[PDB]
């Protein structure tokens, strides 16, 4: 074990020295690629060897033919998926290969796609590689009902699903250019089977959470919506009987409180916030400040009547 | 659910003499060698901590110098270590290192300036370096190097803003480009941002005040984003985002210093991620950093927007208005 390191210490110290020597001397070729792939394997955010991998082929770019300059791309993106494959974690790797597509004639989006679903179901909440996904579905352009799709089966098929919620609230903005009732209804349809599917998983509880905001206001309440957050208020506290350790549940019944009415439910709101203390006394100081936030909200509208 | 237990002889009191002696032992390798790469941010993690416990004296303050100088590329950027390459994050680590020295004029500050300069692109953001690569660290890094130097007006604020404000999200919190999923780390970028640009207005301090308290696990340690393990380093980028936004008191601050101070190496001196792990400098800065966020009397106050102490930033006249 301890000797082992001593020697790749030793080989990637002179492999190191070597690239540096010959970079001073403007030996821009693959010796330098084959030296750097040493390197890069174990330690990909060793940022200025990709740095040298660009230089070595731009400047080859110039001196090789079409056919020649089409084969290093080609080694270049398989270097690059076995890099990922050790570390998919890396910023450097992820840039590298999106400089490298970016510059490309004619580059194969569809196979970049299949890469993200690929990864991300290694890893549903690699952040770089979603993003990567979204450069992707930009440069080829996949219209945000596709992505939305993706998103639907990523959020069903298992769990770790705060990602997906996420791209989900980024999309559904742009397929209506603050969401439209229709939209907004299907949504929480889909978030409250999540969070009753799964009531421990957090991710469901704040996406509802931004849902509760993102529409009418509560003197606009339809009836269809009124009787929709009521029926979802009356299912939080049949989830609260069977988890009572629950917190999301609690705190998400204030929540549709207020969003209903809250003059109205005054006294239960205080009564939960008791009871929500009680079961996550972290929040304590959170809570009471909300507490405090909805009761001036509260002598606000008491102070508005006529 | 994902959380450490802490077992229950876990260190409980703070050992800043062992950390000291880590710290100023720790030039002197494995990991020393493999870290070459961000030798600049390194340097700056060691001195900055010895600097909050009193000890900044028994490091190599010519030295430093010396190689600061030697890093600084005829573009004006600062690399890591010396033959790399010039980076807006190791630029940073740079000027911070010679603030804490007051020793700016080492290197050439109008160069700097003209380098931060030119990394911002049309829509705002700006890129780490000559490659392109954009991410809201970057716009984080550009404001706060030039912040230290007086030179903020070098770059263009209103669209800086407009982009970072881009990366803002659901949850209220900040991704490092626009429509990317928020994270802690990003949230102090971003929050950092915001206040050095007088921007905290912005920002929904309620919602995303929650976000961050909700990274506080029943161990007592913060992580980074739902549903991860907790690390000694959110003690940091979650608590000064939080002071940033005025919300400090949301989360449960003794249960996060014993979390922090189980983290220890009791033998060895410094921090690691969790209790047990192995330690290394940047998780000792950010737990020592950590604690005097939450008051520790034996560690200076430090700056929750440019990770120094307060008295270091009171003497160059940078201290931006918080939220509360
Ligand atoms: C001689 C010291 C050797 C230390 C040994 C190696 C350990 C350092 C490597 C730590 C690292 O890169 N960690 C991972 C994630 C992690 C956390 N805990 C354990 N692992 C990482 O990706 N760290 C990033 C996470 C982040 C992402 C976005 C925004 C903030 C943070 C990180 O800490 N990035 C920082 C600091 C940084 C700067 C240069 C580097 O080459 C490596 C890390 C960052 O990018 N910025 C802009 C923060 C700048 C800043 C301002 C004030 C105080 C501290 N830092
Ligand atoms: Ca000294």
């Known amino acids: 074990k301890r000797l082992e390191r001593e020697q790749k210490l030793k080989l990637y110290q002179s492999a190191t020295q070597a690239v540096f020597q010959k970079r001073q001397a403007g030996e821009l070729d693959e010796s330098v690629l084959e030296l750097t792939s040493q390197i890069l394997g174990a330690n990909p955010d060793f940022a200025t060897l990709w740095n040298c991998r660009r230089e070595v082929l731009q400047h080859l770019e110039t001196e090789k033919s079409p056919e020649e300059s089409a084969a290093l791309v080609k080694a270049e993106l398989g270097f690059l998926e076995s890099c990922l494959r050790v570390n998919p974690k890396s910023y450097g790797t992820w840039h590298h290969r999106c400089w490298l597509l970016s510059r490309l004639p004619e580059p194969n989006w569809a196979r970049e796609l299949e890469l993200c679903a690929r990864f991300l179901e290694a890893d549903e909440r690699n952040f770089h590689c979603w993003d990567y996904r979204r450069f992707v579905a930009a440069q080829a352009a996949v219209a945000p009902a596709e992505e939305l799709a993706f998103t639907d089966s990523l959020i069903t098929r298992n769990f770790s699903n705060y990602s997906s919620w996420h791209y989900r609230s980024c999309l559904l903005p742009q397929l209506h250019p603050r969401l439209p009732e229709n939209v907004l209804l299907k949504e929480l349809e889909l978030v409250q089977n999540a969070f009753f599917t799964d009531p421990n998983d957090q991710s469901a509880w704040f996406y509802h959470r931004w849902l509760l905001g993102a529409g009418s206001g509560r003197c606009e309440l339809s009836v269809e919506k009124s009787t929709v957050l009521q029926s979802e208020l009356e299912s939080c506290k049949e989830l609260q009987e069977l988890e009572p350790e629950n917190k999301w549940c609690l705190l998400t019944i204030i929540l549709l409180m207020r969003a209903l009415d809250p003059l109205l439910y005054e006294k239960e709101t205080l009564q939960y916030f008791s009871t929500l203390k009680a079961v996550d006394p972290m929040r304590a100081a959170y809570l009471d400040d909300l507490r405090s936030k909805f009761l001036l909200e509260n002598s606000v509208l008491k102070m508005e009547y006529a | ?324």
């Open chain 2, 1 to 324: 659910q994902k959380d450490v237990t802490i077992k229950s002889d876990a260190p409980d009191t703070l050992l800043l003499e062992k950390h000291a002696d880590y710290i100023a032992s720790y030039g002197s390798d494995y990991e020393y060698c493999m870290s070459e790469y961000l030798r600049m941010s390194g340097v700056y993690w060691g001195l900055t901590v010895m600097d909050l416990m009193g000890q900044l004296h028994r490091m190599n303050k010519e030295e430093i110098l010396v190689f600061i100088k030697s890093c600084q590329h005829e573009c004006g950027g600062v690399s890591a270590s010396i033959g790399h390459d010039p980076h807006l994050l190791y630029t940073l680590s740079a000027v911070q290192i010679l603030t804490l020295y007051d020793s700016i004029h080492v290197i050439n500050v109008d160069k700097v300036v003209a380098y931060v300069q030119s990394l911002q692109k049309e829509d705002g953001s700006f890129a780490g370096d000559i490659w392109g690569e954009i991410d809201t660290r970057f716009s984080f890094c550009a404001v706060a190097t030039l912040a230290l130097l007086g030179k903020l007006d070098a770059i263009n604020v209103e669209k800086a803003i407009e982009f970072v404000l881009s990366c803002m999200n659901f949850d209220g919190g900040f991704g490092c480009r626009p429509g990317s999923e928020s994270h802690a780390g990003q949230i102090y970028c971003c929050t950092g941002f915001l206040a050095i640009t007088s921007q905290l207005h912005q920002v929904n301090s309620d919602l995303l005040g929650w976000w961050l308290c909700e990274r506080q696990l029943p161990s007592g340690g913060l992580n980074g984003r739902p549903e991860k393990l907790p690390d000694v380093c959110y003690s940091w980028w979650v608590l000064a985002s939080l002071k940033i936004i005025g919300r400090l008191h949301w989360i449960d601050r003794e249960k996060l210093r014993s979390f922090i101070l189980a983290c220890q190496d009791e033998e060895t001196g410094g921090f690691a991620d969790r209790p047990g792990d192995m330690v290394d400098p940047f998780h000792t800065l950010f737990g020592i950093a950590g604690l005097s966020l939450l008051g520790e009397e034996q560690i200076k106050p430090v700056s929750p927007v440019f990770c120094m102490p307060e008295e270091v930033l009171q003497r160059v006249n940078v201290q931006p208005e918080l939220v509360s």
